[PDB]
């Protein structure tokens, strides 16, 4: 069913891109200064804040770029937000904007001191997908959490309460935690967590064994596709009718948009161009804890790990200057593409009768996953079959499969 | 007809429930001391006495339990109780309570010593369903009655007699022992004991024979989930008009019940409450001789065996003291529920005529039984089809099948 899915999230692209064109038109930019990544950041920010202010904002002059620090009425920005959605509410768009941060930040960031604190493991980095992302985010938002995500909230939510309304929560938080396992076992697992009331080391101590369960016995997670303000825009204004025409977020409408995409972006005097581009590209995708060596396959070009990636972050701090600051092209086109997944892969003598039920008439779950984790070879191939497939395979018809004997560069972004 | 079933035994519902609440506002009991089981029991054997006296009350003062010892005029307590049925005798209502005491006897107490001494084996447990059921027990008070039950009966009616009117119970007797079995020779051998009027070892040694015959192929045993007074009374307080709403002891009524009942209990220093809980629930619905796997399945949790389980009886004895006594809150809600069944399962050269029937004109019983008994496999399945039900499914709309591949805990509660 293409009509509703494919139809209802272009209308959602639709908005956000039609709102982004209003928003520039007030700023009264230039084309190339509402494709500068960094003010197109800036506008989205100012709107989730408003609906949930001011900010940075570039301009180009004669040579050089000329920050200007403004501020505008939170409502207005309420007003021109639905206005560009018929005035709807749209939170399904703002939520994308949000999940476009979170992918950015998954990937500009790493997210130690808070993983610690908690009292996760810092090597738990590719469970942590969306930690940033606020608990506002929708329903399909929090889809997009990786495990390890979850465990930080409940720790922390019972971290303090351990040390009324807020049951429901908890348990929920859990049914959406297990349905991220899919494994018997990872499954029940969940359920023996979500027995207790007032669930103190007993459970804090056992979900971390859980999160350590899905470094090996993965769950599933989606990932979308979510790309900046900018580039809807400015795909609305040239023509393209979303909701006419269809989008997806895990399909090849992404990358292909991104084919065509002439976003720029602020460049720091010694930062290396070719690394920006990488950054950004990883936060369209949701691939700032996939194996290095598939992103660099699909990329088309290296995919540098974060430590010798030469950049700091794609936002402008106040601290800086912009006489030494320049701007260039990001590279954000792919070679191939792939189906965004979300799986996470896998390999007396006698009774009295007192019921009337199909009868014959006649230890710790985690040894269980223990049990599992063993048998689990990092050689293991997951998505048997599946492939990747050619920018101009539109319907998913010839899929290719990728051989990774090669000189690589590492698996481990982190 | 749900309209006498229902209505009428909801009718006799009422009346334990009033009487209860007019019995404990007697004693000035509070509303704690009116949900303590071990008061409930005392005040309904007061009254099985009195209509066939004083006893134990336990009172609740700063910290620590007083036990009063109390005598009531055995009339009074029978105007009182007619007083709640409207005047009328409700032997139903008395022989309710006739059967919870049983349901509770058959669950704490193993009645090895009387088997023996009649010549049964020790190992007939599961077929003593109501050996404490006073005779006088009414006719729907016998059906819950064990085949086994019956047989301890007629041997020591027969080991005293072989050792005028007492004729028609033994046939009675039997005919009810025979409405127990539900096959051919089962059936038929029964009528073969029913033969003697003096009834030697010949039938001795048969009957008992067909006993251990129903450890195989079972017969039909009615189980009745019978309360407490105390749970009847706070319903009946709570508001709850049965006998319009209709009630059943078969059904999900007395689950429901129970899902919502405050009962309890007094508990010795080192006994564990969780394990007095089980007990009580067990006699809530006569599984105390279920297989612990389906009794553990609907139950929700852990249905521990006998033997490892930590208590001594419900009601407390003159002996022991109430300093070192306290009390806790009976766990007796349940996963599911189950319609609680009757049945036991299962897998010349010419003649001159001389009168006018329907003719084409021309060993030992026990071995069809022997015979039967061999094909039996304990693995063998019943109730095929019949399920659980959720405590949401009023109504007996959707079944529910379970499986028991799983790491168990035994079958037999002895």
Known sequence: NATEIRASVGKMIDGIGRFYIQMCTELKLSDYEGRLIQNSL????????????????????????????????????RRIWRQAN???????????????????????????????RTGMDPRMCSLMQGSTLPRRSGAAGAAVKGVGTMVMELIRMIKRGIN??????????????????????????????????????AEFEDLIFLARSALILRGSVAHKSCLPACVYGSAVASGYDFEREGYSLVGIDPFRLLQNSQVYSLIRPNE??????????M??????????????????????????????????????????????????????????????????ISIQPTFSVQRNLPSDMRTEIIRLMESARPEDVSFQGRGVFELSDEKATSPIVPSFDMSNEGSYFF
């Open 272 to 281: 290396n161009p070719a690394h920006k581009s990488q950054l950004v590209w």
């Open 164 to 201: 009324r309304r807020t049951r429901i929560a908890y348990e929920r938080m859990c049914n959406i935690l297990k349905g991220k396992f899919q494994t018997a076992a990872q499954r029940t697992m969940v359920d023996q967590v979500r027995e207790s009331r007032n669930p103190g080391n």
């Open 42 to 77: 800036t506008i989205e920010r100012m709107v989730l804040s408003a609906f949930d202010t001011g900010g940075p904002i570039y301009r180009r002059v004669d040579g050089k770029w000329r920050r200007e620090l403004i501020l505008y009425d939170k409502e207005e920005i």
């Open 86 to 116: 018929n005035g709807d509410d749209a939170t399904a768009g703002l939520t994308h904007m949000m999940i476009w941060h979170s992918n950015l930040n998954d990937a500009t960031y790493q997210r130690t001191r808070a993983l610690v």
């Open 283 to 348: 936060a369209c995708h949701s691939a700032a804890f996939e194996d290095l060596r598939v992103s660099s396959f699909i990329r088309g070009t290296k995919v540098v790990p974060r430590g010798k990636l030469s950049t700091r972050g794609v936002q402008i701090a106040s601290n800086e200057n912009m006489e030494t600051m320049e701007s260039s092209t990001l590279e954000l086109r792919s070679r191939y593409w792939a189906i965004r997944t979300r799986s996470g892969g896998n390999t007396q």
